[model samples]
Target: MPAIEVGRICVKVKGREAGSKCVIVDIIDDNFVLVTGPKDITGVKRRRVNILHLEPTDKKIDIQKGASDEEVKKKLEESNLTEYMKEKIKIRMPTL
Candidate 1:
């Protein structure tokens, strides 16, 4: 969906950090964007991620483009969404 936007929170869908929630801090390309979990709360480090790998959430916070991890973290706290971020998603994998 057209949910990719700065400050939008998303769940990592395909990686070691999969199922973890993070915020979109910067849009790098048509298929990539910078996301961060502050690595302190959600264990997601700030890095470039494929937009297709992100599942956007209904929740969003007030942040600007390229906002620092700490800034996003603070906004999450103020928005009372910190607990939501801590709640990890459980992705079911198919057993072969």
Candidate 2:
């Protein structure tokens, strides 16, 4: 599978939403992609996040490009992936 494809799940490694779960909604370019957690699900909103700021996960949902917030929620529910969204990712911080 592609490292960063539409519907792919990832964990935010930076920004205010760090340690949250999100899904790729679109590949904007080599530098960025659109992601969201539908807010109600994982708290991340629809926005362009840098690829480097996201850590790809093995999980993914079946979703189309540019899916609405509600659509993403429904798909996650149907696939039994809602729990994944509910849980926050454990981000490891390096200690010097």
Candidate 3:
């Protein structure tokens, strides 16, 4: 499967929301995609982010493109993936 396809789960490795998990809601283009953390669960907000900024996960949900956060959340809950999404990925910055 395509790692960057819609409904795929990912972690933001670079930005203010770094370490938090997110789901690819829509593909904007070759360079960027829209994502959401549902805010309440992982603290990352819904927005368009660079594809390179996200780290894809093996896990994914069955979701429609441009689905609302509530819909996405429900899918996560239904698929038993909510707890996994709640986790924060630990990122290691480059040493000095």
Candidate 4:
């Protein structure tokens, strides 16, 4: 198996909602990976995934399988993981 890239990849979690769109962030190993989730829905959180039971579908976007060190950095930069997570949070106003 090869390391996945930061692109459109389908992810499924057990006992959760239906499969959702995920952006691969990091490749921990042959069996574990990281992904950002719910690009199309609100309040969706990001998580690390396991490739053991995952089912990938529709290889549309550009994905670097088994990325090198430089490729990993590039993907992290392009992923915008921090910014996306910040936007996902709900802001509350205090009333005094």
Best by lDDT: 2
Question: Relative to the true structure, how large is the alpha-carbon lDDT of every model?
Answer: 0.72, 0.75, 0.74, 0.49
Error of 1 at 61 (Å): 1.1
**Model 4 over residues 1-96: C-alpha lDDT tens digits?**
322655545545442443344556577876688765433333345677666555554543344654433453344346654343224222334563
**Model 1 lDDT per residue over 1-96, tens place:** 335878777775668565677777777787887777765776676778676556877777887776776887788789887787777666467774
- Candidate 3: tens digits of C-alpha lDDT, residues 17-79: 557777777788877877777667767777786765568877778887668778877887898
Model 1 lowest lDDT segment of ten = 87-96
Query: Model 2 over residues 2-94: C-alpha lDDT tens digits?
Result: 467778787756675556777777788877788777677767766786665568777778887768788988988999978867876554577
Regions of candidate 1 where Cα sits further than 4 Å from its true position: 13-18, 89-96
Q: Is candidate 1 or candidate 4 better by TM-score?
A: 1
TM-score of the candidate numbered 3? 0.72
Clashes of 1: 0
lDDT winner between 2 and 4, please give it.
2
lDDT of 1 at 83: 80
Which residue runs does candidate 4 get wrong by more than 4 Å?
1-3, 13-19, 38-43, 62-96
Highest TM-score model number = 2
RMSD for each model, in Å, please?
A: 4.6, 5.0, 4.7, 7.9
